[PDB]
Design an enzyme around this catalytic site. Sequence first.
Site, PDB file in Angstrom:
ATOM      1  N   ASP A   1      36.561  55.463  61.421  1.00 31.93           N
ATOM      2  CA  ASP A   1      35.323  56.480  60.616  1.00 31.93           C
ATOM      3  C   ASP A   1      34.373  56.929  61.772  1.00 31.93           C
ATOM      4  O   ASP A   1      34.648  56.291  63.079  1.00 31.93           O
ATOM      5  CB  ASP A   1      34.755  55.690  59.852  1.00 31.93           C
TER       6      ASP A   1
HETATM    7  C1  LIG Z   1      21.068  41.956  67.217  1.00 28.63           C
HETATM    8  C2  LIG Z   1      20.578  42.276  65.592  1.00 28.63           C
HETATM    9  C3  LIG Z   1      19.932  43.399  65.014  1.00 28.63           C
HETATM   10  C4  LIG Z   1      20.471  43.760  63.335  1.00 28.63           C
HETATM   11  C5  LIG Z   1      19.130  44.606  63.310  1.00 28.63           C
HETATM   12  C6  LIG Z   1      19.331  46.150  63.614  1.00 28.63           C
HETATM   13  C7  LIG Z   1      18.641  46.799  62.181  1.00 28.63           C
HETATM   14  C8  LIG Z   1      19.751  48.068  61.156  1.00 28.63           C
HETATM   15  C9  LIG Z   1      18.509  49.478  61.225  1.00 28.63           C
HETATM   16  C10 LIG Z   1      19.237  50.282  59.611  1.00 28.63           C
HETATM   17  C11 LIG Z   1      19.496  51.473  59.720  1.00 28.63           C
HETATM   18  C12 LIG Z   1      19.269  52.959  58.658  1.00 28.63           C
HETATM   19  O1  LIG Z   1      19.922  52.436  57.015  1.00 28.63           O
HETATM   20  S1  LIG Z   1      20.316  53.926  58.411  1.00 28.63           S
HETATM   21  C13 LIG Z   1      20.789  55.198  57.105  1.00 28.63           C
HETATM   22  C14 LIG Z   1      21.963  54.837  56.533  1.00 28.63           C
HETATM   23  N1  LIG Z   1      22.574  55.101  55.930  1.00 28.63           N
HETATM   24  C15 LIG Z   1      22.895  56.637  55.565  1.00 28.63           C
HETATM   25  O2  LIG Z   1      22.937  57.844  56.336  1.00 28.63           O
HETATM   26  C16 LIG Z   1      23.377  57.442  53.350  1.00 28.63           C
HETATM   27  C17 LIG Z   1      25.011  58.062  54.107  1.00 28.63           C
HETATM   28  N2  LIG Z   1      26.110  57.483  54.702  1.00 28.63           N
HETATM   29  C18 LIG Z   1      26.634  57.908  55.485  1.00 28.63           C
HETATM   30  O3  LIG Z   1      26.503  58.955  56.510  1.00 28.63           O
HETATM   31  C19 LIG Z   1      28.007  56.685  55.973  1.00 28.63           C
HETATM   32  O4  LIG Z   1      28.123  56.076  54.756  1.00 28.63           O
HETATM   33  C20 LIG Z   1      27.676  56.089  57.456  1.00 28.63           C
HETATM   34  C21 LIG Z   1      28.281  54.749  57.515  1.00 28.63           C
HETATM   35  C22 LIG Z   1      26.730  56.666  57.845  1.00 28.63           C
HETATM   36  C23 LIG Z   1      29.483  56.396  58.308  1.00 28.63           C
HETATM   37  O5  LIG Z   1      28.705  58.130  59.245  1.00 28.63           O
HETATM   38  P1  LIG Z   1      29.938  59.422  59.140  1.00 28.63           P
HETATM   39  O6  LIG Z   1      30.106  59.086  57.402  1.00 28.63           O
HETATM   40  O7  LIG Z   1      29.405  60.800  59.469  1.00 28.63           O
HETATM   41  O8  LIG Z   1      30.526  58.898  60.053  1.00 28.63           O
END
Ligand SMILES: CCCCCCCCCCCC(=O)SCCNC(=O)CCNC(=O)[C@H](O)C(C)(C)COP(=O)(O)O
Lengths: 459, 49, 98, 320, 54, 104, 55, 347, 88
Positions: I43
Amino acid sequence: MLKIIIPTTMLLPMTWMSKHNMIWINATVHSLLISLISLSLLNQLGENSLNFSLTFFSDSLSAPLLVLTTWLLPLMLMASQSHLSKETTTRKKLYITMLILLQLFLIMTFTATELILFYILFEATLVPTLIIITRWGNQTERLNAGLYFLFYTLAGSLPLLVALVYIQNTTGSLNFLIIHYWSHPLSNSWSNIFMWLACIMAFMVKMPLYGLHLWLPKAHVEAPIAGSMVLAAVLLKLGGYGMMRITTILNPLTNYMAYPFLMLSMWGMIMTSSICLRQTDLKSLIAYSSVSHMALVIVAIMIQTPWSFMGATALMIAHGLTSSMLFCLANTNYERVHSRTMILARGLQTLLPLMATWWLVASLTNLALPPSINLIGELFIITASFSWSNITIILMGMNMMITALYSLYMLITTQRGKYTHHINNIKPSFTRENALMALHILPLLLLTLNPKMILGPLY
Amino acid sequence: KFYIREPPHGSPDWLKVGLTLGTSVFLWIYLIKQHKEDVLEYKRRNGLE
Amino acid sequence: MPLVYMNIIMAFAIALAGLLMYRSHLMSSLLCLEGMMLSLFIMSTLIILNTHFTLANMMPIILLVFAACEAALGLSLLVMVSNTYGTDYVQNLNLLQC
Amino acid sequence: LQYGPLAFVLGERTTRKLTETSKVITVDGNICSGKGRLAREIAEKLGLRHFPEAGIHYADSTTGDGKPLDVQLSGNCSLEKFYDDPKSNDGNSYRLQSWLYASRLLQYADALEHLLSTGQGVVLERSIYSDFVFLEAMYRQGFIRKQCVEHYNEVKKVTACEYLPPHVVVYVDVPVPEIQSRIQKKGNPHEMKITAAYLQDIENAYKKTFLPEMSEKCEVLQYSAREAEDAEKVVEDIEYLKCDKGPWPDQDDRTFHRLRMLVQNKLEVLNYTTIPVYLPEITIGAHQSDRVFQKFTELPGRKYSPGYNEDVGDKWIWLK
Amino acid sequence: ARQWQPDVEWAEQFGGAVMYPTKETAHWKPPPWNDVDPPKDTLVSNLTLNFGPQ
Amino acid sequence: PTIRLQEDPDPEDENLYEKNPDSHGYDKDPIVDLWNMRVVFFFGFSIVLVLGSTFVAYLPDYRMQEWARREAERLVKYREANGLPLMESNCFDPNKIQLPEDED
Amino acid sequence: LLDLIWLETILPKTTSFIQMKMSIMVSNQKGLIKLYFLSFLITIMISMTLFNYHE
Amino acid sequence: MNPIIYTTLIMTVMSGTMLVMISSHWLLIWIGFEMNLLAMIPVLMKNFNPRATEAATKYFLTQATASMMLMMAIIINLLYSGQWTITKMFNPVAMTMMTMALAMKLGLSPFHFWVPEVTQGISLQAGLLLLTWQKLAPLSVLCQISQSINPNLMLTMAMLSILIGGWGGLNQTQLRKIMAYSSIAHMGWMTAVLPYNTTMTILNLLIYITMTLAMFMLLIHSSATTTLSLSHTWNKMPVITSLMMVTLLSMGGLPPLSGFMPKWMIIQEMTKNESIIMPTLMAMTALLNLYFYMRLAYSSSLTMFPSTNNMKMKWQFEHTKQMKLLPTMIVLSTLVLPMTPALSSLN
Amino acid sequence: SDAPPLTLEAIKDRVLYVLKLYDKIDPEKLSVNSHFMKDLGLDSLDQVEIIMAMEDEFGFEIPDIDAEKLMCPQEIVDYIADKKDVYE
Ligand SMILES: CCCCCCCCCCCC(=O)SCCNC(=O)CCNC(=O)[C@H](O)C(C)(C)COP(=O)(O)O
Ligand SMILES: CCCCCCCCCCCCCCCCC[C@@H](O)O[C@H](CO[C@H](O)CCCCCCCCCCCCCCC)COP(=O)(O)OCC[N+](C)(C)C
Ligand SMILES: CCCCCCCCCCCCCCCCC[C@@H](O)O[C@H](CO[C@H](O)CCCCCCCCCCCCCCC)COP(=O)(O)OCC[N+](C)(C)C
Ligand SMILES: Nc1ncnc2c1ncn2[C@@H]1O[C@H](COP(=O)(O)OP(=O)(O)O)[C@@H](O)[C@H]1O
């Protein structure tokens, strides 16, 4: 003898105060007058030398050398003013200053009564020569030629300085008269052997002895014409003069320390004469000629007989005149065609007949045609060597044949044949060049008329 | 002719020139006098004259 | 000589050796310099006390004064080096070669 | 007496001569804008010394007589043939740029020396800090190579760091089409060949590098074309600046002493302009160098030191 | 027709930090034109302290 | 520029005969060149060569060749008449020489 | 074979080669005070024993 | 830096040297060395930059080590003989340590590494001071204890200095490092004749100081620190390059120049002892210094290197500051050989 | 002297080693022409981790654009060569 030294020191400010367009005229006229004055030194005695003062003396060996130096200065001036025409006034005056300083050092070298003063002057002659070569040479090889000329000389000359100061601490004097009168034999020990080598190697490298001569083709080819003239005519004779002076204190050790240098001289004479047969550069041929003649002079000095000393003196004078004339002859063609390759310009007798006559006379004196003083010296040395050992005639005989071969090879390659078709810029010979050749050649035959003036003190 | 003063003007700096010449003359006369007294003292000590 | 003289001379040699072999910190070598100064002070004081040389009792004070001058000089140079590199490592003084 | 350590030891101090009107001023702007008129008016109103823009023969104007010399012995570059053939294969473009940078450095040193010697203000047209806009315009248009830019950067790095930047930077803003209209109205047949992209590059360089980085040293006074003819308003705008932000307020007597020793001795000023970086555009062979130097030494007032040329009427030489 | 004089290629032999370069010293750089090396960004981190809540 | 440096072109060589068909090869200025020729010829051939050769030819006999010849004639005359040997192997009188006492 | 090669090889070319090699050996130091202060220590220790122990 | 402070520091350097030269007490000599070093450190950093700071740090470390060993040798001498007077140094171990400390101060080989580095890291004026004035005090102390000196150690260090000076100088394009290696070789020559005759040491020191002053003043006049920057001087001031060429020839030791006189007299003095091999090796080695002087002369005076366009602007201006003693220094560096018997006034 | 003159071959071995050091790629199925998205079943987030591993291995940073379009090892090798100007 300040009546000769002071006028040259006056040549210096006369040159530096002259008008921008009279430097050559003034320098030439007063150089010729100084030569005329130095002509008085030929009135020598039969028993001792002329002891002018505590510092300067004139022998029957150094008077012809001084006359040759003072006569060579004006010829160098005439030979230099052609290719220095585009130079600025200050640099032309500096060139003339270098030549005058060289003459002054040479004049003082041949008359110094002490060996340390002689050493200082004979080493001071290096700076003007090195500056002339490395500043007014034409090609990029001149820098390497200057380095070769400097270090070959100094590596031989420094042990001489050590040996001289040691000898003065041992015997209490370096004055040549005291050294001669209070002479004592050298024993057969390693210390004495190394003292002999230290006293001999500097003069050997000045001649230069075969195997120690690699600096000479470089320096004599890469230099300007006046540099080549004074390097071949006078500066090589410093070694012979110094060797005949220093050998007074080296007996009886020389009786066997001379063997390697004698073998080197004879065989390398054969080798350098053979090298002259396959040479593409016209100046390198003349340089190797000088090496062969000086090898003969080395043999004569090493066998230590009156006839060999007479022959050495005559040969040194004759070679100076002949080699300077040959260098000037080659420089004329170089100035015409801007190349040193011998087979480029051919059939020049058709285009320049009088210059061809000068070439013929110079190459006839090179091969020692009788009764030239070249042959007088060569024959005296050959007779002395024959008395030393009857087998030298073979080596000496081979050399005579080879010298004739390469001399006439040079003559036929440059003057005969057919003129190269593409070269159309061969202008008629100037009056200056003809006068230069005449002033080289006429004294040779005039000296043939009266040969006791160049036969040294053993006469 | 010049764009600026070029502080050394057409006349020479007379103070410096005078000081230089005075120093030279003073040194010369001092040397002459010293040589004369040295000669006199040498002649007196060895009793020549 | 007694044992104390040999011990003080050994301390001087150890401090000199310490100065000669650099690790990383410049300050350690400065400390070795101060140690050599202290060793010289002790040795001179013992020699002067043993021979009852009364006017020589004041030389070690002069030695201490010039030791302080030397230490101040070294500390100033260290301040400058640290301001240039943010560290007093002798590895950073390699801009000039032989 | 010549200024030096002895003059500083007893008496002479620069900090006392500064009288709130020292204020090194530079009036920048694009080609054909009326920055020179504004600079002259500012100098006249504020009582400062005016320095016209340094050209090819600026250095000639200050030594010997103020008359210019032959271009072969001075400059060795042409502004006209830069417009005619900006992509000539003889290196005229970068040679001109380098010579002009050296002239600007000399002019800046002269202005600083005047200010530190008299306390009077100076007005300049452009500076060594502004000269790079033309270099960037040449490089973006392909008129010079990248190595020339690197050499320019080296020389600027080792030269411009030793001086103090101007107190106030005045910029006259004129749009490119109006600049073309002015150039056409002028009449000079060489400036007509200036492409609009060249002027656009100069303007971009100005507004995106020079003004941003200059605004951190001191505030910049920008003016449109119409509000630059009213010189009294601009001058009265200059008189109400709070200048306590740049390096100038942090200068004491010893720094001024160092700067004053540097601004005189123009050989020290020009030291690093002739560094042995061998670019074909500016490297001159030994034969030509010798010929041109011999030609220069034969000028009527150039063979000897100023007061020692009797062929232009120097008297009493043998006592100087 | 004229005397040989050094050109750019000849002159560049003396422009290195050293004569007779080797593999070790081929990476030595000549000193800057003025003897001023560029300043390193050896940032010194400030000390971070918790002032409270206790 | 596809060049390496700014240099003057190598110029053609000047012919001294072009501006002076009788040029003597001493200088470009005809008057200076003519006088250079004249001084060279006069002071080289007329003064040094001929007069110096005459001076050397007529140098007085300081080598004592004729004196030695006359002395030898006197000696030969005296020794022939007396019946004495013409020459002696020893050039030093043995009465003034003292050999070492013992040779064993 | 002789003039252009071996006579050149023995006297001047050998001298130039040796001098250049020793120049490279001597002049190529990194400029680290650690290394040549260690050198100083070695020199000091050798000096006391080699020339100092023999008086 | 304030001119008054600079003048005070220069006078303190000279005061330390004079205190070394006029003292009879070992403590006062050590104090003179300390004062000289303390005042010398800031003069090396007058133009502040990282290279100058590094040079000052290296100089301080070397000289502080040397002074520590000096004081230890003094204390050992006091222990074995309660004498503070500078004399024959009654103890051999103390004499060995004293010799090593003074050699470290002078920069004689093996401890010669600091000199090229400090010289390259400072300005030409600081280099002039370091290579001329800073040799006086250790040489004076060495002259005063020459009788108790061990010839084997001093001669070893002198020959090593001559060899290393030549070999190191062969490899340099920076002028300050060339000067430093030249200084190392001349220090070797100075210390080679010290056990036999201190008058020759003084004569060589004076002649070397004159030539070094002339060279450094010529380099300051034409602002060149690299070979290539010196190759431009012909197109601006040819007289300077000609005078530099003649002075370089003099430094090489070629007769009839003044440079030849100290080597000549030292060789004669060493042959007045038995000592034949050592002068021969010393002359053969000085040929290397002559070689790189000649290379510098080739690059700056005997050939013309290409120039730049901006030199035309420099043609229009003159040198503001003038060195009043440069002509006399050049003349003394070149034309003084005929006055050689005047060295008798040195003893 | 400095590091040896890196070539295309060594770049390829290092890239392949880093890729087979990734726990989500089977070694034998991986080839220099395998596509991460289809062949390796990786992915977009997985690709970002691979690019960061390349960044760590080759000691230089690849911007978000540039690095985003490298979908198989050959493109990574080509990008590294073009950035390092390596032709052999
Ligand atoms: C040590 C412990 C610490 C942990 C804490 C970390 C904090 C987390 C912060 C979260 C930020 C967000 O949600 S950021 C927003 C995330 N969601 C989107 O961007 C919507 C579209 N989804 C997609 O594009 C795909 O599902 C994707 C999986 C992105 C792959 O990407 P590709 O298809 O282009 O490979
Ligand atoms: C390329 C051109 C360079 C120039 C040429 C220079 C020529 C130099 C040659 C030197 C000539 C002779 C030197 C020494 C004299 C005798 C040589 C020796 O071989 O003879 C025997 C010596 O015996 C043995 O050979 C011992 C010497 C062996 C060691 C010498 C090394 C030679 C190897 C060749 C090296 C090349 C040298 C030149 C370098 C370029 C004699 O027996 P002996 O009676 O007991 O010794 C006489 C001295 N006494 C009386 C005090 C005892
Ligand atoms: C171009 C056309 C050429 C051909 C046409 C020429 C026409 C004929 C002319 C040629 C002359 C023929 C020569 C025949 C010889 C006659 C002359 C001879 O008899 O004179 C000799 C005399 O000659 C001179 O001694 C030799 C001249 C000296 C040479 C010195 C050269 C001048 C200096 C120039 C520079 C020096 C450079 C070289 C440095 C060493 C005799 O010597 P000597 O037995 O005693 O006399 C006994 C009686 N004395 C003693 C009372 C006088
Ligand atoms: N540093 C420079 N580089 C290139 N050209 C310049 C430079 N300085 C000035 N010029 C040219 O000089 C001409 C006029 O200069 P400018 O000062 O802008 O006009 P004005 O004479 O009205 O003040 C213009 O053709 C401009 O391009």
